[PDB]
Structure formats: structure tokens, C-alpha cells
Amino acid sequence: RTLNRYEKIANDIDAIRGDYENLSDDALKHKTIEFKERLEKGATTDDLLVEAFAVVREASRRVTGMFPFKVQLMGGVALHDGNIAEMKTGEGKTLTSTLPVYLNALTGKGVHVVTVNEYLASRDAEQMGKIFEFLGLTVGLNLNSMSKDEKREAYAADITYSTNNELGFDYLRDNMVLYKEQMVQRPLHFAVIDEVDSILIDEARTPLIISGQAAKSTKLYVQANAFVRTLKAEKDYTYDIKTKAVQLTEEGMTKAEKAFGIDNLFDVKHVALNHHINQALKAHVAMQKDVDYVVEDGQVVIVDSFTGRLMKGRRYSEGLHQAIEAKEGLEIQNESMTLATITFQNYFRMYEKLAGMTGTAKTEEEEFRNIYNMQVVTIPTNRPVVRDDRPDLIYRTMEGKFKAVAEDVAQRYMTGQPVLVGTVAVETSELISKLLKNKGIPHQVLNAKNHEREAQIIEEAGQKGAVTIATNMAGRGTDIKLGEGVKELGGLAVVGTERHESRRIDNQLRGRSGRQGDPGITQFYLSMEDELMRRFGAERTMAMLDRFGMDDSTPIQSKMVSRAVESSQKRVEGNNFDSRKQLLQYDDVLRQQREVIYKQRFEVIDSENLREIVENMIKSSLERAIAAYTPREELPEEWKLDGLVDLINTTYLDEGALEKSDIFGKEPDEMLELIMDRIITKYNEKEEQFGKEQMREFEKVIVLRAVDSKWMDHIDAMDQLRQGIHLRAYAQTNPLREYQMEGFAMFEHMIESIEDEVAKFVMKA
Amino acid sequence: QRVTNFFKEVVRELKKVSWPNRKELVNYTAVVLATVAFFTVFFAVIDLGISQLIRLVF
Amino acid sequence: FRTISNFMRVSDIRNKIIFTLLMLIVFRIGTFIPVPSVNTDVLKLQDQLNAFGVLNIFCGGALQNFSIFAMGVMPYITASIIVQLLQMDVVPKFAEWSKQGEMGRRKLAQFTRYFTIVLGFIQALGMSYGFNNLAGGMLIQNPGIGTYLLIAVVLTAGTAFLMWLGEQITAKGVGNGISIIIFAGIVSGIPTILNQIYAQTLNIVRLLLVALAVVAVIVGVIYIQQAFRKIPIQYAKRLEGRNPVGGHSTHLPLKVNPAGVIPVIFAVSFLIAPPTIASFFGTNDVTLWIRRTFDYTHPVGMTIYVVLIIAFTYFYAFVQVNPEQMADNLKKQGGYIPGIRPGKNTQEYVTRILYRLTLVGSLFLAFIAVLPVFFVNFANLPPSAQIGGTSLLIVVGVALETMKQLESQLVKRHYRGFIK
Numbered sequence A: 001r002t003l004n005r006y007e008k009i010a011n012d013i014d015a016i017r018g019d020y021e022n023l024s025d026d027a028l029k030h031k032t033i034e035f036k037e038r039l040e041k042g043a044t045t046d047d048l049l050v051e052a053f054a055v056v057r058e059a060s061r062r063v064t065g066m067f068p069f070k071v072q073l074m075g076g077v078a079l080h081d082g083n084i085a086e087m088k089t090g091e092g093k094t095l096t097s098t099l100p101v102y103l104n105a106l107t108g109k110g111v112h113v114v115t116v117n118e119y120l121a122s123r124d125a126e127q128m129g130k131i132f133e134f135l136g137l138t139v140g141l142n143l144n145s146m147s148k149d150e151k152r153e154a155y156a157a158d159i160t161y162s163t164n165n166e167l168g169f170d171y172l173r174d175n176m177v178l179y180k181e182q183m184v185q186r187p188l189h190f191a192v193i194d195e196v197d198s199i200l201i202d203e204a205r206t207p208l209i210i211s212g213q214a215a216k217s218t219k220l221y222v223q224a225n226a227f228v229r230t231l232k233a234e235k236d237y238t239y240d241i242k243t244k245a246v247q248l249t250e251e252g253m254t255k256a257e258k259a260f261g262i263d264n265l266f267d268v269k270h271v272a273l274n275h276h277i278n279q280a281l282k283a284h285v286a287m288q289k290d291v292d293y294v295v296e297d298g299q300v301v302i303v304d305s306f307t308g309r310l311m312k313g314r315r316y317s318e319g320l321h322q323a324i325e326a327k328e329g330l331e332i333q334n335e336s337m338t339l340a341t342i343t344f345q346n347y348f349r350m351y352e353k354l355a356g357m358t359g360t361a362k363t364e365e366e367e368f369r370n371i372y373n374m375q376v377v378t379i380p381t382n383r384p385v386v387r388d389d390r391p392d393l394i395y396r397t398m399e400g401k402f403k404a405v406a407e408d409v410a411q412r413y414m415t416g417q418p419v420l421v422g423t424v425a426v427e428t429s430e431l432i433s434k435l436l437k438n439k440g441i442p443h444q445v446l447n448a449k450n451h452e453r454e455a456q457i458i459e460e461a462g463q464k465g466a467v468t469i470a471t472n473m474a475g476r477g478t479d480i481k482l483g484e485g486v487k488e489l490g491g492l493a494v495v496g497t498e499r500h501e502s503r504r505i506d507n508q509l510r511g512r513s514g515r516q517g518d519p520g521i522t523q524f525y526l527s528m529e530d531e532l533m534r535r536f537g538a539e540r541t542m543a544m545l546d547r548f549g550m551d552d553s554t555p556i557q558s559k560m561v562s563r564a565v566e567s568s569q570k571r572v573e574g575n576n577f578d579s580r581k582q583l584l585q586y587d588d589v590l591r592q593q594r595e596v597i598y599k600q601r602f603e604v605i606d607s608e609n610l611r612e613i614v615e616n617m618i619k620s621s622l623e624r625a626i627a628a629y630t631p632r633e634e635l636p637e638e639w640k641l642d643g644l645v646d647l648i649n650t651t652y653l654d655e656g657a658l659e660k661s662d663i664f665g666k667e668p669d670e671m672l673e674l675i676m677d678r679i680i681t682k683y684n685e686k687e688e689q690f691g692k693e694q695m696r697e698f699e700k701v702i703v704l705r706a707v708d709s710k711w712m713d714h715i716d717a718m719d720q721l722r723q724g725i726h727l728r729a730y731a732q733t734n735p736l737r738e739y740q741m742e743g744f745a746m747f748e749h750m751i752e753s754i755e756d757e758v759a760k761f762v763m764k765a
Numbered sequence B: 001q002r003v004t005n006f007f008k009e010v011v012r013e014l015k016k017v018s019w020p021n022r023k024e025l026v027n028y029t030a031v032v033l034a035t036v037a038f039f040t041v042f043f044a045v046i047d048l049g050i051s052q053l054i055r056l057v058f
Numbered sequence C: 001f002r003t004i005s006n007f008m009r010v011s012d013i014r015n016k017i018i019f020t021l022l023m024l025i026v027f028r029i030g031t032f033i034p035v036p037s038v039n040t041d042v043l044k045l046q047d048q049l050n051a052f053g054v055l056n057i058f059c060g061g062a063l064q065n066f067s068i069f070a071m072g073v074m075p076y077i078t079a080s081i082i083v084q085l086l087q088m089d090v091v092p093k094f095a096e097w098s099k100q101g102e103m104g105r106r107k108l109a110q111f112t113r114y115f116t117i118v119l120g121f122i123q124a125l126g127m128s129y130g131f132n133n134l135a136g137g138m139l140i141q142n143p144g145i146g147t148y149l150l151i152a153v154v155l156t157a158g159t160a161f162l163m164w165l166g167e168q169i170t171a172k173g174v175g176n177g178i179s180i181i182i183f184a185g186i187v188s189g190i191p192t193i194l195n196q197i198y199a200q201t202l203n204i205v206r207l208l209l210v211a212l213a214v215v216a217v218i219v220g221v222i223y224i225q226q227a228f229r230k231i232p233i234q235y236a237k238r239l240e241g242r243n244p245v246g247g248h249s250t251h252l253p254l255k256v257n258p259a260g261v262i263p264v265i266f267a268v269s270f271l272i273a274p275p276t277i278a279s280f281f282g283t284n285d286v287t288l289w290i291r292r293t294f295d296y297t298h299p300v301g302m303t304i305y306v307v308l309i310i311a312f313t314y315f316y317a318f319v320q321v322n323p324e325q326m327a328d329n330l331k332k333q334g335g336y337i338p339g340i341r342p343g344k345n346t347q348e349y350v351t352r353i354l355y356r357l358t359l360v361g362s363l364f365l366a367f368i369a370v371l372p373v374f375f376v377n378f379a380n381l382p383p384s385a386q387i388g389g390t391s392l393l394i395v396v397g398v399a400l401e402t403m404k405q406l407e408s409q410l411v412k413r414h415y416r417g418f419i420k
């Protein structure tokens, strides 16, 4: 059992922090130099662990006033081992990140501390960077707004604080550079992932995708948007509430074919019109305004589903963003084109060491074992949870639930206890803010749109008589501190208003209330026309909401609706489980291909002579060109060798240098050797006249341009294959094996095209 | 006479089926006969072996 | 051949080939182990030929076996086909369990395992009692109900052990598990059949003609089994720019024989049920007439057999493919056959395709099923052979599917690169 090992190491650190206490600064900052030279002579980080942890304990008490508890040392040892430290919400996970981050930044290779958003990254960077810069290391903070030089300074520091999006995008942009000295990241060494279950379980359902702008079309967006704006929500389309899929009906298809003058919408010449009609339908019906996006400064800005904040650079793929901009009446932008793609599983499994800490890991433990080979370690609390988690108050309608929520917030405001109401969308947050505006209750709102005042709102949210309505922004890592007298009122009642997509997320909201042994109440007010119940509730229990009556002043005191609420949430969790499993194995196929391509593109970049690489490319292209003619079947002179001579003179050997007589009646390998040594002397004349390093610049540009263009086309073709592959499961094959085999064939044809393009552009230039 | 029209449709349908060509037909028959012959010999040999061991142990 | 030397050069492929062969040796070892109280000498005296072993007899023109694996995985086969027939609008709990996803599928798999144990018990009781009646009451010593339930629970334990062995040889072995065990049962019966044909023996050229006809029927079976009618499918939810190829296009393949071998299950249940219900009534005139006309080695019974194979192939092709569920899935995921509206019109389009393909597949299945009668009659073979029945289809299908699984494991090593 490892937990007794963690307790033993924590007691070791306790004895020697007795030893480390009476040391001045410049004698405690000297311990970093001492550990660095002991780590360069012969020691490992595992031998230095107790002395480094005692130095961080003393330095933290000297800087921040906090002296880490022994459960924080247990979580630090569990993070140094590469495990997942599941300390509860409020327990002190930021100091327990600073223990193994200091221990593993002494070797000089760099530690990445990953968080969920940029508020938490900047907050932790400020406080724990005060600790680390006392000790003598360097803390960079990698933000979305920085330039490449500031990012390179942030990654060159000893400890880098960033969010998971910026790490993924920096990796993807480092494999699109032309010079090696444009890469910002160092080799990936250690990642401490704060809120692991958000990053590695929840947000790992999505890939990071870097796009680049393609040509602009606008007329079909306005045409399809003007068509869909007259379309009668039940006769001409069906909106499926379960999976938010909007489809035309046969009346709507008839009206579409009449409005555009076409005869069949489902031809292969009207696939662009059908795509524009479908994306205008999804933009109108399935994408509600203040729920899914916002309109800021004449632009559609996406509100993130997990973090609940605006994603400024990010745009919807496949023409949905342009359909939303046509719907809103804004300027329709250009299309896009996927340049690079990675998932968070495949990104963080490149990291040579991976740790993590969260409050809510234990239910996902086997997933952390199957993918990341990380073991969830549960840490004690050192002070018991006095937080009061009351059961949910289920109502019939949303108007009755919101009247109850406003009445609860009103009667907690009268005593002086601070309230934090937790919604999800921006529009329900504004609805409940106007529900408290009349009733005369002064509040703050923390939406995606109110992100500028966030650090101010959180500093006032725990005062006496402080109502804060907050979306997903608050309920993940936000540390609300209680004001004077608030701990006697049982401070910070969290009033949730909906169930989220897992028990982990609403446990995180309750964790905003708890906060290390302080009192707190967490009441959830659900409803029966909540979006979780409407979308994932089973159709049996969705029939007797007339049986419960139509009053909504008192909650439904049943036990069949509580089973329905829990089963709907378990249905969402199972759907997300299978969706992230599917994305995992199919991006394992693209992960193998991408790792081959990116490793060889990098060693094209830092190779100070490319003559052997380009000559092997020309020889492989030439062997395939020889074997494309000259087949094994028709040996005696049915070999069409003047066509091969024409191909060599059009691709390799400048228009006159080969005749039929040079390769007449030859074996394929001896004509290969004849053409190959003619190619070598032509290359040597090119390298003589062209220059020596100028020739390397020339063919580096050729090779990298070919690799980039064929790899973007391969990402597109691989996406199209993954569209049709379940239809391949209709023929009683395994469709994953069909995906792997067709992806291998597609990849090898892509590499043959890379070699053909490089051979042609080098030899014929 | 609907049935002769239907049989003309069946013959027309059989020309859109993607039948295996002669190279993969010969490769498939080689794999099938090799598997059947190998497992015939394999099962005869282990029946003889289990029979001798059964005669030893009883 | 080169490819079987390429398999044994990869360590993982060779590892699971060797594990599969060890599990087949385990299966054969257990097929030599007798049942508790079954008195093996009267069993070995019951046969009409000379098989190999003491638990193998040649009864009814079939190599019967009365070890602890006497049932094989046959209760698992009949439990799976019953559960699959119950999913289709008969039991509603199974319908919604199938509609749930990969976790309601686990509920259906759990029910199939418990139903397998129940059906294995009932089949072991019927089998032990019927074999004891065949021997004249002499097969089971101490014919009390405690001995029958001991025999039934040990045969059900043998079948559940074979299902565990199948789970092993599909987890850590070469391919599918139960299919490899079924293949092993058939081709382990092959050598004693060859020994009977040798012990029988114009005759040398007659057996050469028989072997050439067997290779011809194996080629015809590979030809029909590997043939797909590929319906083109167009998806209208991605832009598909920048010169789409058209070579690896998306399509929907329908087999020519989509049913498989299951029509012969239903046809032989229809052909064995009147003789058993007439056997409960004792010998009469109409009992002997029912026994005489429902025997498919004579042309009235063979005609009823062929007609039922064709009719159940049509039924089970439309159960297996289900063009209405196919049309709804195509409409929901946004695909369409080019030219055809994605609702009812694609359902009746692929219904017409399925009528024509099912005619060809049903005639092939009926011909394959009544081929051993013709080989026995017009080749003077012993009736032990059953040479070219539906076991031929099972053997060809398992051989080809395991070969494709192995080559798919092989190609993950050959990712070249342009540098090399």
C-alpha cells in the first residue's frame, strides 16, 4: 500500500523541517544551488525528495505565510511519483503542486504546470511564483496573448504556468516552423496537470485543431440563411432534442427544391447547397445565441462548454461559424482549412512524466489507469468537511424553480450570509439577475461577458451580504475567501440551479462552498423541464409530471423523480465515456501517422546537409517509376520503354538525356543504376553551380513545402474516412480494422506523393 | 409474364456484384486448402499423441 | 509459403498463433475425457462404423461424441440466435436494451450467458436420456435422477468451459473464439472420416473425382462468400474539396448471402420437429408416414428441405439486414444513396437489392446444404462423410476471417516513410 509510504515520507519531511527552520534567506536560497550540484554529481530526484520538500515548506512559510500540512506533503509525494493526488476541493492543492514542481525543476529541463483557464494560471503563477523566485528558480507564464518571443522566454524558464489549450497549440505550431530557432517549446519533460479530470477526461473529448484561412465564399451563406429564416419549426424541419440534430422534412425538402430552382437536392451536383442548408438549419435551431456563443464587437465569439469563458481565436468548423455570422447579420469571414490536429490524450502522453491533482478523480480511476497509466491516490483532509450538502429540490417548471431560487437567495441575503448562485449559460444567468433585480437584492454577475471584473468579483464574493450569480466560470477552481463574521453565519451558501454532465462538475460547485473545514451549505434546485431531463430523461418518468399536479410552490417529494434525475445524469456520463473512447482509438491511428511525419519533418529542419535525404527520395520515386512500367508479368519487350524514357526526361533528367538505347533490354536494377548515377552527376553539377548552403536552403524549402501540403490533404482525407467508417461496420467487419488498413494505404500513398514532388521539384529546377 | 422480367433483373443485378477476381480467388483457395490440410494433420497427430498418453496413464 | 514465415517472424502474431494452438490442444484433451457415469463400453459398441477413440461413435451417419464437451458450444449458438430473434419486436425489454448502446449490449450478453447455461442444462438432460434410450437403457449406470442431473451439470460445465476458452482465445489468441472452437470441432472430425474412406477401399479415380469436386465447391463457396454488392453512399456533411479521389469511396456493402448458415438451423428444426412429436405417439401408420416423408435423404423430404432453406433465407436476410432500420440510420446520420430520397425511397431501393441478392444466396445455400446427399448417393461414399454441407461454409468462413485478422495485425509494422 502506497499511502503508508506517503505518510512515512511526510513524517521524514516533518523531522527535517524541524532542522531547516533557523536558516536565513541567502542560506535557504543557497539550497537550490546545493541541490543542483548534488543533482549533477550523482543523485536522483528521489534521493533529494525530503530535503527539497522541507526547503519548500520553509520557503513557503517565509513567503506566503502558509506552512504546508502533512497531507500537502503526502499529495506532493504522490505527484512526484507520477500518480494522481485526489485531494478534496479546498484542501490546498496549489502548495502541493509547488512541492514536486520545485523538486523536478532542479534538473533544468522545465516543468509545465497546466491549469484549466487563464485566470487560474495567472493566479497560481503569481503566488507560487513568489515562492519559486524566493528559492531562486524562474517562473514563466504562457498566455494566449503573448508573442513568440515572450512565449520562448516563458518556456525557457524553469517552471512554466499555462493552460492546456496553449500548450497544445504551441506544440502544434512548433511542428509548422521553417527554422528550428522558431520553436518556442523545449522538449516535454514534466507536466503537473491541475484539475486533471477536466483536462484529461472531460476536455479530452475534443481535439485541438490549428486552421489556416482558405478562400471566401459568401453568397450561398446568405442564400441558405434567407431560406431557413422562413421555415416553420414543425412542418419543415425536425429538431431532435436528444442529439441536437436538425433535419429537413419532406415538406421542407420540397420547399428547398422549389426555392433554389433545383430538381433534386440530394444529387451529387447539389452537395454544396445541401451542406449550406444543413448548416443554416443548425445555426438557426440548434445554436442558441447567449448559450453557445455571444456577439462581441460585430463578431461571433464561442463560449466554451467546459470552462465557460470566451474562446477568442476559435471558430466553428465546417461552415458553421459563417452560418452563425449570416444568421446574426454580421460580416461573413473566410473559410478555414485544417493545418494541424492533436488530442489531449496524445499530447499529454508525450510528456516523459505526467502527474496531476484534482478533487474528483476516484470515479474515473480506471480510465486514468487504462490510458495514462496513472494511479489515483486519495489523500486525507487534516480537517473534516463540515460543509452541508443538502439534497436536490426538484420542481415541475422552470419558472417555479427560479422563483424558489430567488426566494432562497432573498432569505439568505437578509441574514448576511454570502450566496453564490451557479448557473451554466449566460442567458439563464441574466434571467436570474433580473429575477433578483426586482426584489431589490444587490448582486454581481460573472458571465462569459463579464470576464474583466472576475478577480474583483471573487474578492468580494465571500463578504457579508454578497450575492454572486456565476456560470461555469466560477465552479472549477475559484477560491472564495470569507470575510469577517461570515464564518459565524455558515458562510458561502452555494445554490446550484442545474445538474451538470457529471457528478464531478457539481461536486466542484459544492467544493466552492466547502473550503477547508469552514461551514457551508450547498443546495441544488433542479426542475423537471431542465435540459438534462428533457434531453436524457427516460420517456417513462416524463409522463407523470401531470400526476404531480401544476402548482410549483413546493418541490416534488417523490422518489421516482430522484431516480430519474440520477439515471439521466448517468446516461450523459455513459455517452461521454463512449464518445471519448471512440475518439481515442481512431486518433491512435492518426497518432502513429503524425508521429512519423513530425519526427521526419523535424530532422529535415535540423539537418545541415540534405543531399542524402533528397537522393533517397529521388531513388525511391525512381524505383516506383521503374516498377510502374517494367512489370513482372510481361518480360520480353512488352515494356513500353519509350514511355519510361519520356517519364525520365520529364521528371528527372532534363528533356534529352535518355533514349531507348540506354535502357533497352536491361534488368530493372541495372537501368535503375544507370538512371540513378546520371541523376547523381546532375545533382553534383547543381550543387557545384547553385552553391553549397544555398542548395540546402533551396531543397529544404522544397521538402518542407511538399511535406506540409500533402500532410494537410492527408488530414482532410483521414477525416472523410472517419465519417464513413461505421457504415463499413454494416458489412459485419470490424470498422476500426478497416480504418487502420485504409489509413495505412492512404498514408503510404501520401509519402509516395511527397517523394515524387520533391524529386520533380529538385531535379527539374 | 412478370417472372421472366424478375429473372432478367436478377441477372442484371449479378453484374453489379463485386465478385473476386482470379488472383485473389486462387490465393483464397490456397489459404483454405492449406488451413484444412494443416489442421487435418495437426488434429490427427494430436489424436495419436493423446491416445498414446491415454494408453500409458489409463 | 512466404506469408506464414512472415507471421512467425513477428513476435506478437506468433505468440497468439501458439496460444491458439495450445487452446485447441486443451479442447481436444477435454474431448477425450469421459462423463461421470456413462459406462463407455456400451457407448463404443453402439456405433455402425469404427471411429477413433472410445467416446467417438459413428451414429446416424455423424461422428457423435460423448465426452464432457459432448454439446460443444451448440447451446451458445442456439441461445444467441434465440436472443437475437427476441430483440426484434417480441420482448420489449430486449428491444430497449439493444437501443441503449454498449452497456445495454452487455445486458444482452449477460442474458445470453445465463440462457446458455439454462439451455445447456435442458439439452444435456435430453441428450443423456436420448442416448440412454439409444443404448437400450444400458448407457447410464444407476439411472436415477441424481445421476442424470450430475451428467447434465457436468456437460453444462463443459460447455461453459468451452465458452471461457473462447473468451481466452479471442482475448489473447488469433481471432474470434467461438468460431475457432466450431472450426476445431469440424476439422477434428475430418481425419477419422478420411480413415473410414480409406478403410472402405475405378475407386481411386472415383475418389479423385470426389476430391476435385470438393476443391471446386470450395472455390464456389469462396466466390459467393467474398462478394459484395456495394451501394454508393453520399454524405452531405463535409465540404469534400481539393480533388476527392473516388477510389476509397464510401459505400454500403451487402453480401450475396447475408443470412449465413442460420437458415439451415431453422430448416432442420422444421424438419426434425414432426418426427419427434410423432415419436412421442408411438408407431402407427401416420407416424411411419411422418417419419418417411420428413427424411431429407429421399426426394420429398429433400424438396421440403430446399423449400424451407429458401424461405428461411429470405426471412433471415430481411431480419439480418433490416432495410427499414438501415434507411432510418442513413437518414439520421445524414447519408443518402445518390438519387434516392433518404426516407422510404431508400428503404424500398435496398429492399429490391436485397430481394435479388437473397435469391442467389438462398439457392447457393440450399445447394450447399443438399450436396452431401448427392455425394453419398452418386459417389458410393459411406454415409459417415457429410462431405460439403454447411460445415464447409463454416470452415471456409473461419479460415478466411482468421487470415484477414492476421494480415491486419501484420500491416501495422510496415509503415515506411519517404526516408527509409
Ligand SMILES: Nc1ncnc2c1ncn2[C@@H]1O[C@H](COP(=O)(O)OP(=O)(O)O)[C@@H](O)[C@H]1O
Pocket (backbone or CB within 6 Å): A066, A067, A068, A069, A072, A088, A089, A090, A091, A092, A093, A094, A095, A359, A477, A479, A516
Ligand atoms: N497549508 C496551508 N495553510 C493555510 N492555508 C492554506 C494551506 N494550503 C492551502 N491553503 C489555503 O486554502 C485554500 C485552498 O485553495 P486551493 O488550494 O486553491 O484549493 P484547490 O485545492 O481546490 O485548488 C487556498 O486559499 C489557500 O490559501
Ligand code: BEF
Pocket (backbone or CB within 6 Å): A088, A089, A090, A091, A093, A358, A359, A476, A477, A478, A511
Ligand atoms: F482548485 Be480545487 F480542486 F478547489
Ligand SMILES: [Mg+2]
Pocket (backbone or CB within 6 Å): A093, A094, A194, A477
Ligand atoms: Mg486548484
